[PDB]
Design an enzyme around this catalytic site. Structure first.
Site, mmCIF file in Angstrom:
data_model
loop_
_atom_site.group_PDB
_atom_site.id
_atom_site.type_symbol
_atom_site.label_atom_id
_atom_site.label_comp_id
_atom_site.label_asym_id
_atom_site.label_seq_id
_atom_site.Cartn_x
_atom_site.Cartn_y
_atom_site.Cartn_z
ATOM 1 N N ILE A 24 0.856 -1.151 0.127
ATOM 2 C CA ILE A 24 -0.028 0.202 -0.017
ATOM 3 C C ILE A 24 0.876 1.279 0.148
ATOM 4 O O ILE A 24 0.857 2.279 -0.818
ATOM 5 C CB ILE A 24 -0.891 -0.036 1.192
ATOM 6 C CG1 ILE A 24 -2.019 -1.009 0.896
ATOM 7 C CG2 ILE A 24 -1.651 1.512 1.543
ATOM 8 C CD1 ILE A 24 -3.250 -1.273 1.969
ATOM 9 N N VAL A 32 3.122 -0.272 5.001
ATOM 10 C CA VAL A 32 1.859 -0.777 5.363
ATOM 11 C C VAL A 32 1.535 -1.572 3.991
ATOM 12 O O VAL A 32 1.908 -1.406 2.760
ATOM 13 C CB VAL A 32 0.954 0.388 5.729
ATOM 14 C CG1 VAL A 32 0.914 1.367 4.453
ATOM 15 C CG2 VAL A 32 -0.281 -0.076 5.939
ATOM 16 N N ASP A 142 -2.859 16.314 15.078
ATOM 17 C CA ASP A 142 -2.350 16.372 13.757
ATOM 18 C C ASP A 142 -3.627 16.032 12.788
ATOM 19 O O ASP A 142 -3.390 14.981 11.986
ATOM 20 C CB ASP A 142 -1.178 15.364 13.764
ATOM 21 C CG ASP A 142 -0.408 15.733 12.461
ATOM 22 O OD1 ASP A 142 -0.339 16.721 12.082
ATOM 23 O OD2 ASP A 142 0.428 14.707 12.209
HETATM 24 C C1 LIG Z 1 2.069 6.337 15.331
HETATM 25 C C2 LIG Z 1 2.708 5.862 14.198
HETATM 26 N N1 LIG Z 1 2.171 6.130 12.963
HETATM 27 C C3 LIG Z 1 1.338 5.676 12.131
HETATM 28 O O1 LIG Z 1 1.100 4.470 12.175
HETATM 29 C C4 LIG Z 1 0.778 6.370 10.887
HETATM 30 N N2 LIG Z 1 -0.143 5.459 9.926
HETATM 31 C C5 LIG Z 1 0.654 5.162 8.719
HETATM 32 C C6 LIG Z 1 -0.526 4.567 8.018
HETATM 33 C C7 LIG Z 1 -0.608 3.928 6.856
HETATM 34 C C8 LIG Z 1 -1.904 3.317 6.470
HETATM 35 C C9 LIG Z 1 -3.171 3.373 7.118
HETATM 36 C C10 LIG Z 1 -4.305 2.681 6.548
HETATM 37 N N3 LIG Z 1 -4.802 2.935 5.570
HETATM 38 C C11 LIG Z 1 -5.599 2.284 4.958
HETATM 39 N N4 LIG Z 1 -5.856 2.474 3.573
HETATM 40 C C12 LIG Z 1 -5.063 3.290 2.665
HETATM 41 C C13 LIG Z 1 -5.377 2.641 1.216
HETATM 42 C C14 LIG Z 1 -4.758 3.508 0.102
HETATM 43 O O2 LIG Z 1 -5.282 4.831 0.337
HETATM 44 C C15 LIG Z 1 -4.989 5.479 1.657
HETATM 45 C C16 LIG Z 1 -5.703 4.489 2.915
HETATM 46 N N5 LIG Z 1 -6.566 1.567 5.667
HETATM 47 C C17 LIG Z 1 -6.372 1.427 6.866
HETATM 48 C C18 LIG Z 1 -5.364 1.963 7.357
HETATM 49 CL CL1 LIG Z 1 -4.684 2.058 9.306
HETATM 50 C C19 LIG Z 1 -3.034 4.087 8.520
HETATM 51 C C20 LIG Z 1 -1.629 4.535 8.894
HETATM 52 C C21 LIG Z 1 -1.491 5.159 10.122
HETATM 53 O O3 LIG Z 1 -2.258 5.623 11.165
HETATM 54 C C22 LIG Z 1 4.322 5.888 14.136
HETATM 55 C C23 LIG Z 1 5.019 6.958 13.363
HETATM 56 C C24 LIG Z 1 6.560 7.110 13.635
HETATM 57 C C25 LIG Z 1 7.208 6.154 14.087
HETATM 58 C C26 LIG Z 1 6.710 5.153 14.664
HETATM 59 C C27 LIG Z 1 5.244 5.067 14.750
#
Ligand SMILES: C[C@@H](NC(=O)CN1Cc2ccc(-c3nc(NC4CCOCC4)ncc3Cl)cc2C1=O)c1ccccc1
EC number: 2.7.11.24
Length: 350
Positions: A24, A32, A142
């Site tokens: 993704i 991811v 954020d």
């Molecule tokens: C705190 C932590 N940061 C994160 O985890 C931030 N992220 C990164 C991310 C990537 C994907 C998704 C997501 N995406 C989808 N679909 C996608 C399909 C394509 O189009 C876009 C949407 N579906 C469910 C989800 Cl959950 C959620 C998150 C999230 O929350 C961190 C930071 C620094 C250091 C350590 C930890």
């Protein structure tokens, strides 16, 4: 029979439950993928986090995990599962499994005109999620279009709680030009003047920015650097009133504002000529310069613009305020790993 799956170099050590992985995306957090969940028979999002070599990645990881495991709300992303090694010694990664969402509001805004009905529904859902967040005395800090996930039926879920904090209004004051972590274009004017971003009003500002961006598919205040952000804000809101200036007791901040030539307010209906007039009335109240005068989440929900959706009995709050056991700064990389290990034990076979 089975082995470690790879994707774009990385081991995705998620099996046996999670198979058939597709890339993704990627960022500072890690990587991811979608994966087929073999127990629930759905594709899920899985993010591989590898944070243990720097303490800020560890902080964002633990806030995200602790907050999202505590929260349960339809407009907030959950954590379905967490995968990691059976021991602290063997734990180099954490895989957080979440519901897969089709897209995000950032991607949708770069490609799609939003009808007024879509804008109304998205805003309703952002605020309904934020009501619950704020009821737990938590600040997201954020909020932006890329942190709003959308499914194929436009259901919306707030994600990324790595910068979230317990509110602390009595320690909100700071000096002029204090550095800040959260995303520039969605920062309230007071961050640049006298605020550490420890009050609920900082999230309402960001939501305000998101609403303006929904109306035109362009960020309202796309500042290119720390202080340019404030000057974009004042370019539209105009000069602060004497009353709003008098609330800024910090002299450096006050005198900066006084040094600027007088600017009039650009009226919302000229920035947004096709917008519903009720939407611009709500926008105005969210993008209020003075954070004390800025509308609160529950008041926003009760605004005439959202009347078709508004139902306080169907806008739940948290069972109790959130509090971290320990102050997460001044805590080393090594202790935050231990706390992450503890916080993820419930998902282990046991
Ligand atoms: C705190 C932590 N940061 C994160 O985890 C931030 N992220 C990164 C991310 C990537 C994907 C998704 C997501 N995406 C989808 N679909 C996608 C399909 C394509 O189009 C876009 C949407 N579906 C469910 C989800 Cl959950 C959620 C998150 C999230 O929350 C961190 C930071 C620094 C250091 C350590 C930890």
């Amino acid at each position: 029979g089975a082995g470690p799956e790879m994707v774009r170099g990385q081991v995705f050590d998620v099996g046996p439950r999670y198979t058939n992985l597709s890339y993704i995306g990627e960022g500072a957090y890690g990587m991811v993928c979608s994966a087929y969940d073999n127990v629930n028979k759905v594709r899920v999002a899985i993010k591989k986090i590898s944070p243990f070599e720097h303490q800020t990645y560890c902080q964002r990881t633990l806030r995200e995990i602790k907050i999202l495991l505590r929260f349960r709300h339809e407009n907030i992303i959950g954590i379905n599962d967490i995968i990691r090694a059976p021991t602290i010694e063997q734990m180099k990664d954490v895989y957080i499994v979440q519901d897969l969402m089709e897209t995000d509001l950032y991607k949708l805004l770069k490609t799609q005109h939003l009808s007024n009905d879509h804008i109304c529904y998205f805003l309703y859902q952002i605020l309904r999620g934020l009501k619950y967040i704020h009821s737990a005395n938590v600040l997201h800090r954020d909020l932006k279009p890329s942190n709003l996930l959308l499914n194929t039926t436009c259901d919306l879920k707030i994600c990324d709680f790595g910068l979230a904090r317990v509110a602390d209004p009595d320690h909100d004051h700071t000096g002029f030009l204090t550095e800040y972590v959260a995303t520039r274009w969605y920062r309230a004017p007071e961050i640049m003047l006298n605020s550490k971003g420890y009050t609920k009003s900082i999230d309402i500002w960001s939501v305000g920015c998101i609403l303006a961006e929904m109306l035109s598919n362009r960020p309202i205040f796309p500042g290119k650097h720390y202080l340019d952000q404030l000057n974009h804000i004042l370019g539209i809101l105009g000069s602060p009133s004497q009353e709003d200036l008098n609330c800024i007791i910090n002299l450096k901040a006050r005198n900066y504002l006084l040094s600027l030539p007088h600017k009039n307010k650009v009226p919302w209906n000229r920035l947004f000529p096709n917008a519903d007039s009720k939407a611009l009335d709500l926008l105005d109240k969210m993008l209020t310069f003075n954070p004390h005068k800025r509308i609160e989440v529950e008041q926003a929900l009760a605004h005439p613009y959202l009347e078709q959706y508004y139902d306080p009995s169907d806008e739940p709050i948290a069972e109790a305020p959130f509090k971290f056991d320990m102050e997460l700064d001044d805590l080393p990389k090594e202790k935050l790993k231990e706390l992450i290990f503890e916080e993820t034990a419930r998902f282990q076979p046991g």
